[PDB]
Amino acid sequence: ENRLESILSRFDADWTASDEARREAKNDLFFSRVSQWDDWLSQYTTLQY
Amino acid sequence: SAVSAVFHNLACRIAPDYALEATAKIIATAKYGKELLYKQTAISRAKRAPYPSRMPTGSGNSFPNLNEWHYFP
Amino acid sequence: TKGDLVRAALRKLGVASDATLTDVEPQSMQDAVDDLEAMMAEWYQDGKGIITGYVFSDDENPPAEGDDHGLRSSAVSAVFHNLACRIAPDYALEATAKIIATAKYGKELLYKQTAISRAKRAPYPSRMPTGSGNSFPNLNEWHYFP
Amino acid sequence: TKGDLVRAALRKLGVASDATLTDVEPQSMQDAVDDLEAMMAEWYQDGKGIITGYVFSDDENPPAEGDDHGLRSSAVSAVFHNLACRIAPDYALEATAKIIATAKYGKELLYKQTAISRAKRAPYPSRMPTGSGNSFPNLNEWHYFP
Fold first, then answer.
1. In this complex, which chains have at least 3 CB pairs below 8 Å with chain D?
2. Measured between alpha carbons, how far is residue D19 from residues C17, D14, D24 in Å?
3. Residues of C numbered 20-79 whose beta carbons fall under 8 angstroms of chain D's beta carbons: which are they?
4. Quick one: residue C68, left, alpha or beta (phi over 0 = left, psi -120 to 50 = alpha)?
5. Helix D33-42 vs helix C9-18: angle between axes, to the nearest 10 degrees?
6. Residue A46's closest chain C neighbor by CA?
7. Which of the residues B7, B9, B18, B25 would you substitute to probe the C interface, choosing the one with the greatest number of C C-beta atoms within 10 Å?
8. Partner of B57 for a Cys bridge, out of A6, B73, C72, C103, CB 3.0 to 4.6 A?
9. Contact of D34 with C14, CB cutoff 8 Å
10. CA of C110: how far to CAs of B55, C72, C73, C76, D85, in Å?
11. What whole-number distance in Å separates Cα of residue D100 and Cα of residue C33?
């Protein structure tokens, strides 16, 4: 199962978790941004429609 | 460079003084010189008015900064 | 001499051939060198015009016979028709149909390479999708960002 | 058998015979030789002009005969007609109806093969499908080609 060394068990799962916290979870909260909030994103102090 | 344009139009204007009328090359170059001075100028002075009070700020924006113009949102 | 005129001593006599000056005209002038310098002052400012490969030689020591226009080899075949037209009213003459036709077609071929290179659409508007057909753009909105 | 007119000097004296049988023409001024080489410069200007097989500039002592030809047999009837129109204002004359008709059709012959070569669209845009209508597309989802 999990590695004999406790800290090594973290590292082996951290490598696949890196693409989870970079790529995946970034896109994940954008789903909820379109449905629960405005479709357009990433404009800053705009007064135009 | 503007010197190069204007004296062709000037050559047409002094022609009535001498009881003459300018030839085809002088009037062609003169109109081209008159057109060339205002060439870049007209593009820069072409502008449309800013948005009126009628235009909504929109709630579809991120950082909306209040809603609906009156010339202040 | 040569297919390329970068010397103003060869420039005057080249324009004079096209204008057919044998000094039977009302006057003889040195203007041809001064004519090209003025005609590529005008064409090189105020939104420019035709670009002929000319480099400036204004405000220099020569009388306007030693100064160097620096025109291209192919740029020769255009200019001396346009130059021979402009100095023609001074001699109380007007250019023939071949000279004015070649003058316009010549300067158009010199601008031909320039107008090709200036063609390409301006960047995307303030509102443009970031798409979901795109794979990992890692950005939302394309404003004037891309 | 010479229709070829090797060495461009022969083409210029052929224009003189075409203009007048006795070869007597009005006033003229030397340095029409730079105009001949410049015509062959402008043609094939930056590789985008009509291909004549000439270099932009040639010299020996005159530039006109600094390259004898480098033309086809067919291409001879092109060049000396366009040349006839060009040096006609230099002789204070203007080309006839048969000469200007052949001159336009002449430079069209040299470009006839070049036109067909440049006529062919470049490959697909930066976005293209390929679906499942291909087995081995060469990697599914095209742009240009992967």
1. C
2. 18, 9, 8
3. 20-22, 24, 72-74, 76-78
4. beta
5. 90
6. C126
7. B25
8. B73
9. yes
10. 48, 9, 11, 10, 21
11. 31
Which segments of chain B does DSSP mark as H helices, in order? 3-13, 24-37, 39-44
Rounded Cα distance, C13 and D29, in Å: 9
For chain C, where are the alpha helices, taking DSSP H only? 9-18, 33-42, 76-86, 97-110, 112-117
Residues 6+ apart with CB under 8 A from D127: D143
Nearest CA in chain A to B73: A47
Whose tokens are 């820069």? That residue is B44
Say how many CA atoms lie within 13 Å of C127 toward its Cβ: 8
The method recorded for this entry reads: cryo-EM
Q: At residue B41, what is the residue type?
A: T
Is residue D142 helix, strand or coil?
strand
Q: What is the DSSP track for D30-59?
A: S--HHHHHHHHHHTTSTT-S---S--S---
C-alpha D143 chain-centroid distance? 38
Token pair 């010299």 in the structure block, residue: D59
Spatial CB neighbours of A49, under 8 Å, sequence gap ≥ 6: B55, B56, B57, B58, B60, B61
Q: Partners of D142 in the beta sheet? A: D128
What the block records as the tokens of D26 is: 């009005």
Q: Which of B51, B55, B65 sits opposite A45 (nearest CB)?
A: B65
Count of other CB atoms within 10 angstroms of residue C43: 21
User: What residue type is assigned to position C134 of the chain?
Assistant: N
Closest CA to C8 of D57, C16, C103: C16
Taking CA C66 as the corner, what is the angle to CA C62 and CA C72, rounded to the nearest 5 degrees?
A: 130
**Four-residue CA torsion sign, C35, C39, C45, C51:** negative
